[PDB]
Paper text:
Acetyl-CoA synthetase (Acs) generates acetyl-coenzyme A (Ac-CoA) but its excessive activity can deplete ATP and lead to a growth arrest. To prevent this, Acs is regulated through Ac-CoA-dependent feedback inhibition executed by Ac-CoA-dependent acetyltransferases such as AcuA in Bacillus subtilis. AcuA acetylates the catalytic lysine of AcsA turning the synthetase inactive. Acs enzymes consists of two consecutively operating modules, a C-terminal domain (CTD) catalyzing the first and a N-terminal domain (NTD) for the second reaction step.
Initial three-dimensional (3D) classification (T = 4) of 1,194,314 selected particles using AlphaFold-predicted AcsA dimer as starting model yielded two distinct states. After multiple rounds of processing, those two states were turned out to be AcsA homodimer and AcsA-AcuA complex, determined at 2.89 Å and 2.93 Å resolution, respectively. MP analysis of AcsA alone (i.e., 37.5 nM) resulted in detection of a monomer (71 kDa) and a dimer (140 kDa).
Author numbering:
A (entry chain B), B (entry chain A): 5 to 453
Write the structure that this text describes.
């Protein structure tokens, strides 16, 4: 059991906050509580650009060809420009699905934020998807607009999708066809002021496609209200301060990079770092050393591959700027935890959630001891349990299905065009079952199986 | 008489503060007041880089070839690197004179900050100086180190200066001679951590050379304590908020671009903008529109050339971001005031000071009415008057010599290696005379002649 380290954490004590927390208190930190105008994108970007965080660096893009950095004001301007481009050329209205199919780049974030600002539902696609996956995801969602690069423009079958009107191409000298629009040319002539579509807490703003047990991808829809939890988990689990440099290594194509690489940091007003190109221990360690990254959010595969690079490889670089390390996507091996404590002299914080959950649910905390191999405890305001097939709670140390009490803000609203699968996730008694096996200890800690 | 505009200014009421202000209150905003370790460079840069302003953009640089942005952390790191370079290669110790002879560039600011951090006295030279002026200024100061560029390396007579040991060259493929060190290679191998030389309030940190009435340049020495006034005038006259973009167009070679282009903004933790290349209305208006500059500090000549450009030239660009405009270096023709109020719809704030005064003394304020053509009123904590040749105050509307009561923090400590000229600036009764004629009105406003 790795002991906790004393410090000035956002969550001072877990127990009292868990016993007393109410989501109405979390709703106080947002602008719409005082004004009534609600939008996740506005809360993530434009709220800070109109505050003392206006000139704070929001985004750090490092790539071999280009090295750029943007402030909150510049991010807001680029997002407004992208939203105007989409509204004018793609004819995107509230509720439309805008799919973004490009490698990780500042334009990706600008376009995603602009799409969400104007009321569209943004769906990111992995750059490595072939023709089949792109076809299925564009057909199921009936996506109106796709934004891509010349390299991946050949992987989209425009002729096989009657519901796809416009294709935006960023970069390169792409010839604008009947349904192809060169994004940069349109953007250069657009304004930086956007009339933001004010939304309702039950309207969707993200659409993420997951590989289902039946073999067909399903669209998970998240609503704006999820930002509430996205903010709170950004403060408790990430422990984001004002002086933190935050780096999330997950791709924006997946849910992890979209939630905790875009929204969780920027809702807290943090500084986010994205790095282009493929993985290499040289590039990652050099990025950490040069940018002085304080908060790191990565995946167990990347950490294990880091382990494969050797201890001296890390010892060649200065990693003293790091202060908080977190992992997600796979239940972490405690040997990786020992290696991290041996290299960075830090505890790697394992967190658990799924695409349907919207945000992390069961996590390790800076103020809590970390038991190696354990997922941790549910966040305050969220109730979790180990239940049988009849919805009855099981005593500790008994194997069972990991269930969460229905009703947390970051819950998925539905499964796109498949209500039966949506209702298939819930058990009698208000228990959302995740299909995963876990067991609770006598101390309240959860262990995955 | 241009009326004042209501707003949330730092100086809410001029009269009450002027009647009650004491410099001991101003001393409370600095770290040294509690810690006891005093340095102007630390207060300007490293204090903010260790606060909630760590990731705030400190410097924008823009020219025809480069476009870079630096945060307070990055500025601190570059300054520490430059200080280490100077300490190791130039053998610069406390009290030495380090002269900087280069065009405006991030390297200039890094080198000047690093020199001041290690206790040296920084002296900037105008890029347009020929061999004669550089020779006189390097001989009078007995400067140990000169830092320059390959273009201006030919304008320095190394052989004629026995007191010049090292010459640093930044950029270009300069062959390192017996006394020539190429700055970039030395910097690349140096650390970003600097053991800062903690100083005393009466030690000099700036040396500025002015054209004297006798024809020979004289070295005006300013002490660290001046930062106090440099901070206060940065808050009252500049009206710097947290969300202000500050642009000073004066060259760092002169006193104006050093006090109010380096120290006054960064002591307040503001964002400074520097633009390379020659003046052109296209470049200046585009810089204002693109960066959204809020606070502007320029010179009447630069405003007059923008007059010559025409109103239709400015009407093309977006200048709504500007909220405060100030002028210095020459009495301001009030026709320029009407033109500014016509174009930017703003009041141009004229300020008066000299190289010997260290910071502005008599200014217009955001909370005060601006009488066109008047220099304004003395800052709180500074007493000014119109005196005759015998040191007696004159009644309003009578011509006389403009004198300031001796003892303000930003006073020059001495004239370098010439005490007689230093004592020649003061009259009996504690009145420092500036050699300029001005008259007071019945309302306390000063008018230059």
């Amino acid at each position: 059991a790795l002991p906790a380290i004393e410090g000035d954490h956002n969550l001072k004590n877990y127990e009292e906050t868990y016993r007393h927390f109410d989501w109405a208190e979390a709703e106080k930190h947002f602008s719409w509580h005082e004004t009534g105008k609600l939008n996740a994108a506005y809360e993530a970007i434009d709220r800070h650009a109109e505050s003392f965080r206006k000139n704070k660096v929001a985004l750090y893009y490092k790539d071999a060809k280009r090295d750029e950095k943007y402030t909150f004001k510049e991010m807001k301007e680029e997002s407004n420009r992208a939203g105007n481009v989409l509204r004018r050329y793609g004819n995107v209205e509230k509720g439309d699905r805008v799919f973004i199919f490009m490698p990780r780049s500042p334009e990706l974030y600008f376009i995603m934020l602009g799409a969400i600002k104007i009321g569209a539902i943004a769906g990111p696609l992995f750059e490595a998807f072939m023709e089949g996956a792109v076809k299925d995801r564009l057909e199921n969602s009936e996506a109106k607009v796709v934004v891509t690069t010349p390299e991946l423009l050949e992987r989209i079958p425009v002729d096989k999708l009657p519901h796809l009107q416009h294709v935006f191409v960023v970069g390169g000298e792409a010839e604008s066809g009947t349904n192809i629009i060169n994004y940069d040319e349109a953007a250069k002539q657009e304004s930086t002021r956007l009339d933001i579509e004010w939304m309702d807490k039950k309207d969707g703003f993200l659409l993420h496609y997951t590989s289902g047990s039946t073999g067909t991808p399903k669209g998970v829809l998240h609503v704006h209200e999820a930002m509430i939890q996205q903010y709170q988990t950004g403060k408790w689990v990430l422990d984001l301060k004002e002086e933190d440099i935050y780096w999330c290594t997950a791709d924006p194509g997946w849910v992890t990079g979209t939630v905790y690489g875009i929204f969780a940091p920027w809702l807290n007003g943090a500084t986010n770092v994205i790095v282009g190109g493929r993985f290499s221990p040289e590039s990652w360690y050099g990025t950490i050393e040069q940018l002085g990254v304080n908060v790191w959010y990565s995946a167990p595969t990347a950490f294990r591959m880091l382990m494969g690079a050797g201890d001296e490889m890390a010892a060649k670089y200065d990693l003293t700027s790091l202060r908080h390390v977190l992992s997600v996507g796979e239940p972490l091996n405690p040997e990786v935890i020992r290696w991290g404590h041996k290299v960075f002299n830090k505890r790697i914080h394992d967190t658990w959630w799924m695409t349907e959950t919207g945000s992390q649910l069961i996590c390790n905390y800076p103020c809590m001891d970390i038991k190696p191999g354990s997922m941790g405890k549910p966040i305050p305001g969220v109730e979790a349990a180990i239940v049988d097939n009849q919805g009855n709670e099981l005593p500790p140390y008994r194997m069972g299905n990991l269930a969460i009490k229905k009703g947390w803000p970051s819950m998925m609203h539905t499964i796109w065009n498949n209500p039966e699968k949506y209702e298939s996730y819930f058990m009698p008694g208000g228990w959302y079952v995740s299909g995963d096996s876990a067991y609770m200890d006598e101390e309240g800690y959860f262990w995955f199986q």
